[PDB]
Design a protein around this motif. Structure first.
Motif, PDB file in Angstrom:
ATOM      1  N   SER A  12       5.960  16.252   3.583  1.00  0.00           N
ATOM      2  CA  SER A  12       5.885  17.298   2.577  1.00  0.00           C
ATOM      3  C   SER A  12       5.030  16.839   1.401  1.00  0.00           C
ATOM      4  N   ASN A  13       4.563  17.810   0.620  1.00  0.00           N
ATOM      5  CA  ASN A  13       3.796  17.491  -0.576  1.00  0.00           C
ATOM      6  C   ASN A  13       4.631  16.628  -1.512  1.00  0.00           C
ATOM      7  N   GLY A  14       4.033  15.543  -2.000  1.00  0.00           N
ATOM      8  CA  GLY A  14       4.712  14.624  -2.885  1.00  0.00           C
ATOM      9  C   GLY A  14       5.452  13.495  -2.199  1.00  0.00           C
ATOM     10  N   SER A  15       5.557  13.513  -0.874  1.00  0.00           N
ATOM     11  CA  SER A  15       6.188  12.420  -0.148  1.00  0.00           C
ATOM     12  C   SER A  15       5.207  11.263   0.009  1.00  0.00           C
ATOM     13  N   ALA A  16       5.752  10.056   0.157  1.00  0.00           N
ATOM     14  CA  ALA A  16       4.940   8.847   0.146  1.00  0.00           C
ATOM     15  C   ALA A  16       5.356   7.898   1.261  1.00  0.00           C
ATOM     16  N   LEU A  17       4.364   7.188   1.792  1.00  0.00           N
ATOM     17  CA  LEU A  17       4.554   6.086   2.722  1.00  0.00           C
ATOM     18  C   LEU A  17       4.313   4.774   1.988  1.00  0.00           C
ATOM     19  N   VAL A  18       5.114   3.763   2.303  1.00  0.00           N
ATOM     20  CA  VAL A  18       5.004   2.450   1.680  1.00  0.00           C
ATOM     21  C   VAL A  18       4.822   1.433   2.795  1.00  0.00           C
TER      22      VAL A  18
ATOM     23  N   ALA B 139      -3.763  10.788  -1.231  1.00  0.00           N
ATOM     24  CA  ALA B 139      -4.507  11.146  -0.038  1.00  0.00           C
ATOM     25  C   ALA B 139      -4.220  12.583   0.371  1.00  0.00           C
ATOM     26  N   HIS B 140      -5.069  13.080   1.258  1.00  0.00           N
ATOM     27  CA  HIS B 140      -4.855  14.343   1.943  1.00  0.00           C
ATOM     28  C   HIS B 140      -4.084  14.087   3.230  1.00  0.00           C
ATOM     29  N   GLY B 141      -3.476  15.149   3.758  1.00  0.00           N
ATOM     30  CA  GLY B 141      -2.531  14.974   4.850  1.00  0.00           C
ATOM     31  C   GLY B 141      -3.136  14.279   6.055  1.00  0.00           C
ATOM     32  N   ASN B 142      -4.322  14.721   6.481  1.00  0.00           N
ATOM     33  CA  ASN B 142      -4.931  14.149   7.678  1.00  0.00           C
ATOM     34  C   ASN B 142      -5.402  12.721   7.439  1.00  0.00           C
ATOM     35  N   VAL B 143      -5.891  12.426   6.233  1.00  0.00           N
ATOM     36  CA  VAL B 143      -6.325  11.065   5.931  1.00  0.00           C
ATOM     37  C   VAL B 143      -5.135  10.118   5.970  1.00  0.00           C
ATOM     38  N   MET B 144      -4.009  10.540   5.393  1.00  0.00           N
ATOM     39  CA  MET B 144      -2.806   9.720   5.422  1.00  0.00           C
ATOM     40  C   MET B 144      -2.335   9.491   6.852  1.00  0.00           C
ATOM     41  N   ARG B 145      -2.381  10.534   7.682  1.00  0.00           N
ATOM     42  CA  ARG B 145      -1.973  10.391   9.076  1.00  0.00           C
ATOM     43  C   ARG B 145      -2.876   9.416   9.821  1.00  0.00           C
TER      44      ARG B 145
ATOM     45  N   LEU C 226       0.852  -1.182   0.000  1.00  0.00           N
ATOM     46  CA  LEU C 226       0.000   0.000   0.000  1.00  0.00           C
ATOM     47  C   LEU C 226       0.890   1.234   0.000  1.00  0.00           C
ATOM     48  N   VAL C 227       0.808   2.029  -1.059  1.00  0.00           N
ATOM     49  CA  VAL C 227       1.521   3.298  -1.145  1.00  0.00           C
ATOM     50  C   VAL C 227       0.512   4.413  -0.927  1.00  0.00           C
ATOM     51  N   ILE C 228       0.805   5.307   0.011  1.00  0.00           N
ATOM     52  CA  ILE C 228      -0.017   6.484   0.264  1.00  0.00           C
ATOM     53  C   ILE C 228       0.824   7.708  -0.062  1.00  0.00           C
ATOM     54  N   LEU C 229       0.348   8.512  -1.005  1.00  0.00           N
ATOM     55  CA  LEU C 229       1.065   9.671  -1.515  1.00  0.00           C
ATOM     56  C   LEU C 229       0.245  10.921  -1.241  1.00  0.00           C
ATOM     57  N   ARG C 230       0.870  11.925  -0.634  1.00  0.00           N
ATOM     58  CA  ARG C 230       0.210  13.210  -0.446  1.00  0.00           C
ATOM     59  C   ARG C 230       0.170  13.959  -1.771  1.00  0.00           C
ATOM     60  N   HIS C 231      -0.973  14.571  -2.060  1.00  0.00           N
ATOM     61  CA  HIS C 231      -1.107  15.315  -3.301  1.00  0.00           C
ATOM     62  C   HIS C 231      -0.218  16.558  -3.269  1.00  0.00           C
ATOM     63  N   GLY C 232       0.003  17.129  -4.446  1.00  0.00           N
ATOM     64  CA  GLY C 232       0.860  18.285  -4.575  1.00  0.00           C
ATOM     65  C   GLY C 232       0.227  19.543  -4.005  1.00  0.00           C
TER      66      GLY C 232
END
Lengths: 235, 235
Positions: A212-218, A185-191, A9-15
């Motif tokens: 930061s914008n564009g950073s991703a969790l794997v 995702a949006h920042g709070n949803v990803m958190r 599962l990759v979660i990426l914050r939008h720009g």
């Protein structure tokens, strides 16, 4: 060579969005990517491509800054054909009255004690949109939503209360079937998703710095959906 | 004021691709939009917006020229959130050996009688890709396809044989439920769908002129899925 996990599962914050640039709360307000935000999406696409990700499905919110980032990323990955799903339950918090305000006026609106809960916790609920205020939920795209599920002022806890059922019912089953899933995702949803998957508490989550914008969790899982590893990859 | 139909199907031809500009057959070859083709997609989006279309779902092929046109059109319409579905069964004919050839060499390859069938009918089947020829179906995006359904050289009849079940099973039921459906299609797929809905024969279809890039057909249906009207709207 490396061992591939059973599912990923990759979660990426939008720009960057225009509201983010203006330093104004957006929430459900449908602010679009800036020129920089579009370049953030291309950079995130190149980041994921260099890590060799090939996704089976991608999820986004109903908000354009999430959807446009998703389309750009799939363009870079050469995966524009994959199943894409957009659902309002992955939307950022509905900020109610705070929608459109400068993120600095909230120090005036909030007492000092209230500000502490806003930054250190996730339970503080903004008040609803004022009379005459442009409410983003009045947009025709939500006309098929039951009025009783439409939020008007959401704490992060309330947002996660409506997003968690969608995560468990639509996204988790695909991970359990060995799929590679992308969420823009949006920042709070990803958190909130990170807290759930890693079994953190609210205080630890808000202690961590925002990606930061564009950073991703794997997140990597085995065939029993046990969490094996969390990586942070960034430009 | 005008009476709205029970359901509506808009079929839009994608914008100019690089193969179209080069005057070379593409078929399943995944040629992308040119700069002009991207402007064709924006113009088609403005065309549909001026006609007041609000779609419940959009369909495209697996080919980038179709998908990118769909995304641009939804961007113009402010409907980026709607359900989008991409399926290989809406792909253009797989041209086999003819893939990548100049559209003028086929006069050499074909006898004069064969050329007549190519333009006046829909039953002529191109031969398969030659040894060593880059076959578009070898792309990893089709790895989940059963090898027995993968075409290698398709007449328009064969293409419609594989696209018709998808049209009847996925698209028609939504029209029967009063949905407004957009399909961003390839030229031959759009022609086959028009022939089916209007109950034409192969000869009448190929007599009609081809719609320019960005032109759209609008089919209107009542609640029994009887065809009420076909309009052609163009920039």
């Amino acid at each position: 060579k490396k061992i591939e996990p059973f599912s990923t599962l990759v979660i990426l914050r939008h720009g960057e969005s225009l509201s983010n640039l203006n330093r104004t709360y957006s929430g459900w307000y449908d602010t679009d990517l800036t020129e920089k935000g579009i370049e953030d999406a291309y950079a995130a696409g190149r980041l994921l491509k260099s890590h060799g990700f090939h996704f089976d499905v991608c999820f986004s919110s109903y908000l354009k800054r999430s959807i446009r980032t998703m389309w750009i990323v799939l363009d870079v990955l050469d995966q524009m054909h994959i199943q894409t799903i957009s659902n309002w339950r992955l939307n950022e918090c509905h900020f109610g009255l705070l929608t459109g305000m400068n993120k600095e006026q909230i120090c005036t609106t909030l007492t000092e004690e209230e500000l502490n809960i806003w930054k250190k916790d996730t339970c503080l609920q903004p008040p609803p949109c004022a009379p005459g205020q442009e409410n983003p939920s009045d947009d025709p795209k939500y006309k098929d939503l039951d009025p009783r599920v439409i939020p008007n002022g959401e704490s992060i806890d309330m947002m996660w209360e409506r997003a968690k059922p969608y995560f468990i019912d639509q996204i988790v089953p695909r991970l359990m079937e060995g799929k590679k899933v992308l969420i823009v995702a949006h920042g709070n949803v990803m958190r909130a998703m990170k807290k759930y998957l890693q079994k953190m508490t609210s205080e630890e989550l808000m202690n961590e710095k925002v990606l930061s914008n564009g950073s991703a969790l794997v997140f990597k899982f085995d065939n029993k959906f046990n969490l094996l590893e969390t990586e942070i990859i960034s430009e």
